[PDB]
């Protein structure tokens, strides 16, 4: 049956980790990881999630199935965080949230909900996009198209090329937005361009589907959500896919949310029950632990206080590593302005290096970067900066 | 977009829980729950998983993503438990395991692996089957057919009707087997009939897909696996979908496994990488907590010792509740032999009650049973037995 000729192929960002843990070479550096690392090169458990898991250890009395949409508190915290406490959507009950196995679990659920309950045939993902959005959408049977996004020769957002490539999208087409700055690019848009894109989806009939995996890593938790909140300010309907893997350090617990907005409460509840039947046929009901830890921290000032400082330290670290990188590049002699790496947000940026320049990095210097030129700033530490920069300088 | 006429419908076993928590009525009893309950009517956390989670609390230092297939230890324990320690399959490396979000997450992954990488078009599920197998398989796009299984007027397995309905299955058809006795029926087959069905799938070309969610609840952990191990004794290929929700009391952590067997190592690894690409496009990588708790208990004699006694007490409880039920039925005067409820294994049996008789139970006596006549023996306690039996007796 699988009796031969069952095919094979590898994940573009993950497969690199294998010939990372494979090298003897001392200075060896893994960039193009997905996760945050501290100054030690460890991805530590947050103190707040350790405190939260101790609470949970003493207080859980059962391990009985969660509802198909998960933990109630979690969903409300997820909407408080994505849309605000003073918020029409939460208020008017036009948003329903399903806790999901990670932000990627939420996109498959958006995708399957969409494929069988609507007329949506295409979904539009930026070029470039996180590689896996495409597979999520194709596995639901939706076909995936690509709108322009990244400049390249200016290292910015090509706003004109974005708009002018998206016009080709017809009305019931889904367009995927990166709310909290973009993987792999690090680029935004500005609030004005978010407003401009929110406008041009209202009059042109597109359905927004936000992917929101790095809330609290660009400017700040709430500042990051202006984009989503510009679109929700004027969309009758939208889907958000959020993850708590990054900002809570809760990666292997698979914590995420799939929020649906639908015009009014009644509609959102009829649509969200088909969202719940898509989940039920998939993984049945979500994993309690990580989400139980998220609902406890956020629903406790003591613990949310420490978490936010923990998030402010993660974010602060990456910002001085984006600054120490551009700077040790200047310092070890670079022939190019890498200062675009500043106002580029989050862990990732395309460094402008070519396929050739990347392979040359891994082979010659032990600096593993995702084959596209994307590097993870959080995998950089103040003791890394000089081996790192030296290598890049050698190559250009 | 969801702007109306987006449809709706409810889950046949779950929707009952809502007008369960909705009644004032004192004696109120919820049967047709899925989970185990102790003599108190609580679904307690196992001592062993509390000890295991304390270990984990002190020893985890990171919450970094698990591989797409999960925790290595977990997968080997899952194969030690499903096929044995002295086992050709594990030995010859012809079995690969993906930790999955619950046994239902494993069936969707089997289903999606099958739909896009093979010629499988139909899958055959017993009539009756756990309601949700069908939706799992239809959402993958496979069409679902039903083979005969349950007698009704003898309250047993109709073996002739099973075999003679399955002949209609062509060679690349998948047939779903319940390894560890059957949901909703409680019926088996015998080792001889397992041997007989394993035989008749070898010469007839069917692909076995086992659903294994109640290991250690029928006879014992290992005794329960004779069926799976009769089929694996002679199948080049098979898929197992197992869950640790029941036997570990780990329901909301979503712990499961999807095992693939493929003739030889090379094949199983080419097939399992397409299994991993199906997972990657679904939920990306599985939840650590519950599986981390399963790998710790099973990979520690002290803790596995206490767990097994905990499993032997769960199983022992249900066996005396199947016996106290048939007995208080005899005692409160029953007009019918309910002794078929003995050798019927697990928590569930069809009691032989009609749709009419069930609605009459909930409305008149506050005894919620799944509309099909299926009742969960573990939701019965020694203080329940008399309200319970009285009600059923009143109705027949
Ligand atoms: C846009 C997006 C990106 O870029 C990622 C990055 N790995 C993720 C990850 O999903 P998670 O479930 O948090 O691992 C999700 N989403 C929705
Ligand atoms: C056959 C089977 C049944 O009957 C059930 C019962 N709920 C499950 C449950 O999946 P889980 O993921 O353990 O909740 C799975 N499987 C595979």
Short mmCIF file of N, CA and C in Angstrom, two decimals, chain B residues 250-372:
data_model
loop_
_atom_site.label_atom_id
_atom_site.label_comp_id
_atom_site.label_asym_id
_atom_site.label_seq_id
_atom_site.Cartn_x
_atom_site.Cartn_y
_atom_site.Cartn_z
N UNK B 250 -5.31 11.26 31.34
CA UNK B 250 -4.61 12.40 30.81
C UNK B 250 -5.34 13.12 29.68
N UNK B 251 -6.68 13.03 29.73
CA UNK B 251 -7.63 13.48 28.75
C UNK B 251 -7.41 14.86 28.23
N UNK B 252 -7.35 15.92 29.03
CA UNK B 252 -7.21 17.24 28.46
C UNK B 252 -5.79 17.57 28.08
N UNK B 253 -4.82 16.66 28.23
CA UNK B 253 -3.49 17.00 27.80
C UNK B 253 -3.25 16.62 26.37
N UNK B 254 -4.19 15.82 25.85
CA UNK B 254 -4.23 15.37 24.48
C UNK B 254 -3.02 14.54 24.13
N UNK B 255 -2.96 13.35 24.67
CA UNK B 255 -1.78 12.51 24.50
C UNK B 255 -2.19 11.37 23.59
N UNK B 256 -1.52 11.14 22.46
CA UNK B 256 -1.81 10.01 21.60
C UNK B 256 -0.64 9.69 20.71
N UNK B 257 -0.78 8.62 19.95
CA UNK B 257 0.26 8.19 19.06
C UNK B 257 -0.28 7.65 17.75
N UNK B 258 0.43 7.89 16.65
CA UNK B 258 0.06 7.35 15.36
C UNK B 258 1.26 6.54 14.91
N UNK B 259 1.11 5.21 14.91
CA UNK B 259 2.16 4.31 14.55
C UNK B 259 1.88 3.84 13.14
N UNK B 260 2.95 3.72 12.36
CA UNK B 260 2.90 3.25 10.99
C UNK B 260 3.75 2.00 10.92
N UNK B 261 3.35 0.94 10.25
CA UNK B 261 4.20 -0.23 10.04
C UNK B 261 4.33 -0.34 8.52
N UNK B 262 5.47 -0.68 7.88
CA UNK B 262 5.46 -0.66 6.42
C UNK B 262 6.09 -1.69 5.51
N UNK B 263 6.68 -2.76 6.10
CA UNK B 263 7.26 -3.97 5.46
C UNK B 263 8.71 -4.13 5.86
N UNK B 264 9.34 -2.95 5.88
CA UNK B 264 10.74 -2.83 6.24
C UNK B 264 11.01 -1.40 6.71
N UNK B 265 12.19 -1.19 7.29
CA UNK B 265 12.59 0.12 7.76
C UNK B 265 12.57 1.22 6.72
N UNK B 266 13.19 1.02 5.57
CA UNK B 266 13.31 2.05 4.54
C UNK B 266 12.00 2.67 4.07
N UNK B 267 11.04 1.75 3.88
CA UNK B 267 9.70 2.09 3.44
C UNK B 267 8.98 2.84 4.51
N UNK B 268 9.04 2.32 5.75
CA UNK B 268 8.34 2.95 6.86
C UNK B 268 8.88 4.33 7.05
N UNK B 269 10.16 4.62 6.75
CA UNK B 269 10.76 5.93 6.92
C UNK B 269 10.40 6.87 5.79
N UNK B 270 10.13 6.36 4.59
CA UNK B 270 9.71 7.19 3.46
C UNK B 270 8.25 7.57 3.59
N UNK B 271 7.46 6.60 4.06
CA UNK B 271 6.05 6.78 4.35
C UNK B 271 5.88 7.69 5.57
N UNK B 272 6.59 7.45 6.68
CA UNK B 272 6.50 8.29 7.87
C UNK B 272 6.97 9.73 7.66
N UNK B 273 7.83 10.07 6.69
CA UNK B 273 8.18 11.45 6.40
C UNK B 273 7.01 12.16 5.72
N UNK B 274 6.13 11.44 4.98
CA UNK B 274 4.91 12.03 4.44
C UNK B 274 3.89 12.10 5.55
N UNK B 275 3.96 11.21 6.55
CA UNK B 275 3.17 11.31 7.75
C UNK B 275 3.60 12.57 8.48
N UNK B 276 4.90 12.89 8.52
CA UNK B 276 5.37 14.07 9.20
C UNK B 276 5.07 15.35 8.47
N UNK B 277 4.98 15.33 7.14
CA UNK B 277 4.57 16.51 6.37
C UNK B 277 3.07 16.79 6.53
N UNK B 278 2.23 15.75 6.76
CA UNK B 278 0.79 15.88 7.07
C UNK B 278 0.61 16.53 8.43
N UNK B 279 1.40 16.13 9.45
CA UNK B 279 1.41 16.75 10.78
C UNK B 279 1.86 18.19 10.72
N UNK B 280 2.97 18.44 10.02
CA UNK B 280 3.52 19.78 9.86
C UNK B 280 2.51 20.79 9.27
N UNK B 281 1.66 20.34 8.35
CA UNK B 281 0.67 21.20 7.75
C UNK B 281 -0.59 21.28 8.58
N UNK B 282 -0.64 20.46 9.63
CA UNK B 282 -1.76 20.45 10.53
C UNK B 282 -1.48 21.24 11.81
N UNK B 283 -0.76 20.70 12.79
CA UNK B 283 -0.56 21.38 14.04
C UNK B 283 0.90 21.60 14.32
N UNK B 284 1.75 21.27 13.35
CA UNK B 284 3.18 21.49 13.36
C UNK B 284 3.93 20.51 14.22
N UNK B 285 3.87 20.51 15.55
CA UNK B 285 4.54 19.53 16.40
C UNK B 285 3.68 19.32 17.65
N UNK B 286 3.70 18.17 18.33
CA UNK B 286 2.71 17.83 19.34
C UNK B 286 2.93 18.51 20.70
N UNK B 287 1.95 18.61 21.61
CA UNK B 287 2.10 19.03 23.01
C UNK B 287 2.95 18.21 23.98
N UNK B 288 4.10 18.71 24.42
CA UNK B 288 4.96 18.05 25.37
C UNK B 288 4.35 17.59 26.67
N UNK B 289 3.57 18.39 27.43
CA UNK B 289 3.24 18.01 28.81
C UNK B 289 2.69 16.63 29.07
N UNK B 290 1.57 16.26 28.47
CA UNK B 290 1.02 14.96 28.76
C UNK B 290 1.90 13.81 28.34
N UNK B 291 2.58 13.96 27.22
CA UNK B 291 3.40 12.89 26.72
C UNK B 291 4.69 12.77 27.49
N UNK B 292 5.09 13.91 28.05
CA UNK B 292 6.29 13.99 28.87
C UNK B 292 5.99 13.30 30.17
N UNK B 293 4.75 13.46 30.66
CA UNK B 293 4.31 12.74 31.84
C UNK B 293 4.25 11.24 31.49
N UNK B 294 3.81 10.80 30.30
CA UNK B 294 3.70 9.37 29.97
C UNK B 294 5.04 8.66 29.82
N UNK B 295 6.00 9.38 29.24
CA UNK B 295 7.31 8.83 29.03
C UNK B 295 8.01 8.71 30.39
N UNK B 296 7.92 9.68 31.33
CA UNK B 296 8.46 9.60 32.71
C UNK B 296 7.95 8.42 33.58
N UNK B 297 6.63 8.24 33.72
CA UNK B 297 6.00 7.14 34.43
C UNK B 297 6.46 5.81 33.83
N UNK B 298 6.30 5.60 32.54
CA UNK B 298 6.64 4.32 31.93
C UNK B 298 8.13 3.99 31.91
N UNK B 299 8.96 5.04 31.95
CA UNK B 299 10.41 4.93 31.99
C UNK B 299 10.88 5.23 33.41
N UNK B 300 10.33 4.51 34.40
CA UNK B 300 10.68 4.66 35.81
C UNK B 300 9.88 3.57 36.47
N UNK B 301 10.49 2.57 37.09
CA UNK B 301 9.76 1.45 37.68
C UNK B 301 8.90 1.82 38.86
N UNK B 302 9.37 2.79 39.63
CA UNK B 302 8.68 3.19 40.83
C UNK B 302 7.34 3.72 40.44
N UNK B 303 7.39 4.66 39.49
CA UNK B 303 6.24 5.36 38.97
C UNK B 303 5.36 4.54 38.05
N UNK B 304 5.93 3.66 37.23
CA UNK B 304 5.16 2.78 36.37
C UNK B 304 4.48 1.75 37.24
N UNK B 305 5.03 1.43 38.41
CA UNK B 305 4.48 0.46 39.36
C UNK B 305 3.21 0.95 39.98
N UNK B 306 3.25 2.23 40.33
CA UNK B 306 2.13 2.83 40.96
C UNK B 306 1.14 3.03 39.85
N UNK B 307 1.47 3.60 38.69
CA UNK B 307 0.52 3.73 37.58
C UNK B 307 -0.22 2.44 37.27
N UNK B 308 0.48 1.32 37.11
CA UNK B 308 -0.16 0.08 36.76
C UNK B 308 -1.16 -0.32 37.82
N UNK B 309 -0.87 -0.06 39.09
CA UNK B 309 -1.84 -0.37 40.11
C UNK B 309 -3.04 0.57 40.00
N UNK B 310 -2.76 1.82 39.64
CA UNK B 310 -3.79 2.79 39.41
C UNK B 310 -4.61 2.32 38.22
N UNK B 311 -4.00 1.72 37.19
CA UNK B 311 -4.77 1.28 36.06
C UNK B 311 -5.50 0.02 36.48
N UNK B 312 -4.90 -0.83 37.31
CA UNK B 312 -5.56 -2.04 37.73
C UNK B 312 -6.71 -1.65 38.63
N UNK B 313 -6.70 -0.51 39.32
CA UNK B 313 -7.84 -0.17 40.14
C UNK B 313 -8.98 0.43 39.34
N UNK B 314 -8.67 1.13 38.24
CA UNK B 314 -9.67 1.71 37.39
C UNK B 314 -10.41 0.59 36.72
N UNK B 315 -9.63 -0.36 36.21
CA UNK B 315 -10.19 -1.47 35.50
C UNK B 315 -10.98 -2.35 36.45
N UNK B 316 -10.50 -2.52 37.68
CA UNK B 316 -11.18 -3.35 38.66
C UNK B 316 -12.50 -2.74 39.10
N UNK B 317 -12.55 -1.42 39.12
CA UNK B 317 -13.74 -0.73 39.52
C UNK B 317 -14.86 -0.93 38.51
N UNK B 318 -14.53 -0.76 37.23
CA UNK B 318 -15.50 -0.88 36.15
C UNK B 318 -15.97 -2.31 36.21
N UNK B 319 -15.11 -3.33 36.29
CA UNK B 319 -15.58 -4.72 36.35
C UNK B 319 -16.57 -5.01 37.50
N UNK B 320 -16.43 -4.38 38.68
CA UNK B 320 -17.45 -4.65 39.69
C UNK B 320 -18.66 -3.76 39.51
N UNK B 321 -18.56 -2.66 38.78
CA UNK B 321 -19.74 -1.88 38.46
C UNK B 321 -20.48 -2.61 37.32
N UNK B 322 -19.87 -3.35 36.39
CA UNK B 322 -20.61 -4.06 35.37
C UNK B 322 -21.36 -5.20 36.05
N UNK B 323 -20.79 -5.67 37.16
CA UNK B 323 -21.33 -6.77 37.95
C UNK B 323 -22.37 -6.28 38.95
N UNK B 324 -22.22 -5.08 39.51
CA UNK B 324 -23.17 -4.53 40.44
C UNK B 324 -24.38 -4.00 39.68
N UNK B 325 -24.21 -3.65 38.40
CA UNK B 325 -25.29 -3.18 37.54
C UNK B 325 -26.16 -4.37 37.18
N UNK B 326 -25.64 -5.39 36.48
CA UNK B 326 -26.43 -6.58 36.21
C UNK B 326 -27.10 -7.08 37.49
N UNK B 327 -26.40 -7.05 38.64
CA UNK B 327 -26.97 -7.50 39.91
C UNK B 327 -28.03 -6.64 40.53
N UNK B 328 -27.88 -5.31 40.65
CA UNK B 328 -28.96 -4.48 41.19
C UNK B 328 -30.11 -4.46 40.19
N UNK B 329 -29.89 -4.78 38.90
CA UNK B 329 -30.98 -4.89 37.95
C UNK B 329 -31.78 -6.12 38.34
N UNK B 330 -31.13 -7.29 38.48
CA UNK B 330 -31.77 -8.51 38.98
C UNK B 330 -32.53 -8.25 40.28
N UNK B 331 -31.88 -7.50 41.17
CA UNK B 331 -32.39 -7.21 42.49
C UNK B 331 -33.56 -6.24 42.49
N UNK B 332 -33.58 -5.21 41.64
CA UNK B 332 -34.72 -4.31 41.64
C UNK B 332 -35.80 -4.88 40.72
N UNK B 333 -35.61 -6.12 40.24
CA UNK B 333 -36.66 -6.86 39.53
C UNK B 333 -36.64 -7.03 38.01
N UNK B 334 -35.61 -6.64 37.25
CA UNK B 334 -35.62 -6.75 35.79
C UNK B 334 -36.21 -7.98 35.09
N UNK B 335 -36.89 -7.53 34.04
CA UNK B 335 -37.58 -8.39 33.10
C UNK B 335 -36.66 -8.92 31.99
N UNK B 336 -35.34 -8.67 32.04
CA UNK B 336 -34.45 -8.98 30.93
C UNK B 336 -33.08 -9.30 31.47
N UNK B 337 -32.38 -10.16 30.71
CA UNK B 337 -31.00 -10.48 31.02
C UNK B 337 -30.15 -9.35 30.44
N UNK B 338 -29.58 -8.66 31.42
CA UNK B 338 -28.61 -7.65 31.17
C UNK B 338 -27.24 -8.23 31.40
N UNK B 339 -27.11 -9.54 31.68
CA UNK B 339 -25.82 -10.20 31.90
C UNK B 339 -24.85 -10.20 30.72
N UNK B 340 -25.32 -9.81 29.53
CA UNK B 340 -24.47 -9.59 28.38
C UNK B 340 -23.52 -8.46 28.73
N UNK B 341 -23.90 -7.56 29.65
CA UNK B 341 -23.05 -6.46 30.08
C UNK B 341 -21.74 -6.91 30.70
N UNK B 342 -21.74 -8.19 31.11
CA UNK B 342 -20.54 -8.90 31.52
C UNK B 342 -20.01 -9.54 30.22
N UNK B 343 -18.69 -9.52 30.06
CA UNK B 343 -17.98 -9.85 28.82
C UNK B 343 -18.68 -9.17 27.64
N UNK B 344 -18.36 -7.92 27.99
CA UNK B 344 -18.46 -6.64 27.33
C UNK B 344 -17.39 -5.96 28.23
N UNK B 345 -16.48 -5.26 27.57
CA UNK B 345 -15.23 -4.82 28.16
C UNK B 345 -15.15 -3.33 28.02
N UNK B 346 -14.50 -2.70 28.99
CA UNK B 346 -14.34 -1.26 28.97
C UNK B 346 -15.46 -0.57 29.71
N UNK B 347 -15.57 0.73 29.49
CA UNK B 347 -16.56 1.53 30.18
C UNK B 347 -17.94 1.42 29.57
N UNK B 348 -18.01 1.11 28.26
CA UNK B 348 -19.25 1.22 27.50
C UNK B 348 -19.85 -0.06 27.00
N UNK B 349 -21.17 -0.02 27.12
CA UNK B 349 -22.01 -1.04 26.56
C UNK B 349 -23.27 -0.42 26.04
N UNK B 350 -23.81 -1.06 24.99
CA UNK B 350 -25.18 -0.76 24.61
C UNK B 350 -26.05 -1.62 25.55
N UNK B 351 -26.92 -0.95 26.28
CA UNK B 351 -27.79 -1.61 27.22
C UNK B 351 -28.99 -2.30 26.61
N UNK B 352 -29.26 -2.07 25.30
CA UNK B 352 -30.40 -2.65 24.62
C UNK B 352 -31.61 -1.75 24.74
N UNK B 353 -31.50 -0.58 25.38
CA UNK B 353 -32.61 0.34 25.51
C UNK B 353 -32.89 1.08 24.21
N UNK B 354 -34.17 1.38 23.91
CA UNK B 354 -34.54 2.05 22.67
C UNK B 354 -34.45 3.56 22.81
N UNK B 355 -34.48 4.32 21.70
CA UNK B 355 -34.45 5.78 21.71
C UNK B 355 -35.47 6.32 22.71
N UNK B 356 -36.63 5.67 22.62
CA UNK B 356 -37.78 5.97 23.42
C UNK B 356 -37.43 5.79 24.88
N UNK B 357 -36.93 4.59 25.23
CA UNK B 357 -36.49 4.23 26.58
C UNK B 357 -35.42 5.16 27.12
N UNK B 358 -34.54 5.71 26.30
CA UNK B 358 -33.52 6.63 26.78
C UNK B 358 -34.13 7.99 27.15
N UNK B 359 -34.96 8.57 26.28
CA UNK B 359 -35.55 9.88 26.51
C UNK B 359 -36.45 9.88 27.70
N UNK B 360 -37.03 8.73 27.91
CA UNK B 360 -37.88 8.46 29.03
C UNK B 360 -36.95 8.50 30.26
N UNK B 361 -35.72 7.96 30.20
CA UNK B 361 -34.79 7.99 31.34
C UNK B 361 -34.39 9.39 31.79
N UNK B 362 -33.88 10.20 30.86
CA UNK B 362 -33.49 11.58 31.14
C UNK B 362 -34.63 12.44 31.66
N UNK B 363 -35.79 12.36 30.98
CA UNK B 363 -36.93 13.21 31.29
C UNK B 363 -37.58 12.84 32.60
N UNK B 364 -37.81 11.54 32.80
CA UNK B 364 -38.52 11.08 33.98
C UNK B 364 -37.68 10.81 35.22
N UNK B 365 -36.42 10.37 35.03
CA UNK B 365 -35.60 9.93 36.16
C UNK B 365 -34.25 10.59 36.38
N UNK B 366 -33.84 11.40 35.40
CA UNK B 366 -32.55 12.06 35.47
C UNK B 366 -31.44 11.03 35.37
N UNK B 367 -31.34 10.36 34.21
CA UNK B 367 -30.34 9.35 33.92
C UNK B 367 -30.14 9.60 32.43
N UNK B 368 -29.04 10.29 32.25
CA UNK B 368 -28.62 10.75 30.97
C UNK B 368 -27.78 9.63 30.40
N UNK B 369 -28.21 9.11 29.27
CA UNK B 369 -27.49 8.07 28.55
C UNK B 369 -27.54 8.52 27.11
N UNK B 370 -26.48 8.20 26.39
CA UNK B 370 -26.31 8.58 25.00
C UNK B 370 -27.44 7.96 24.24
N UNK B 371 -28.07 8.83 23.45
CA UNK B 371 -29.28 8.51 22.71
C UNK B 371 -29.40 7.13 22.02
N UNK B 372 -28.25 6.47 21.78
CA UNK B 372 -28.16 5.13 21.20
C UNK B 372 -28.34 3.94 22.14
#
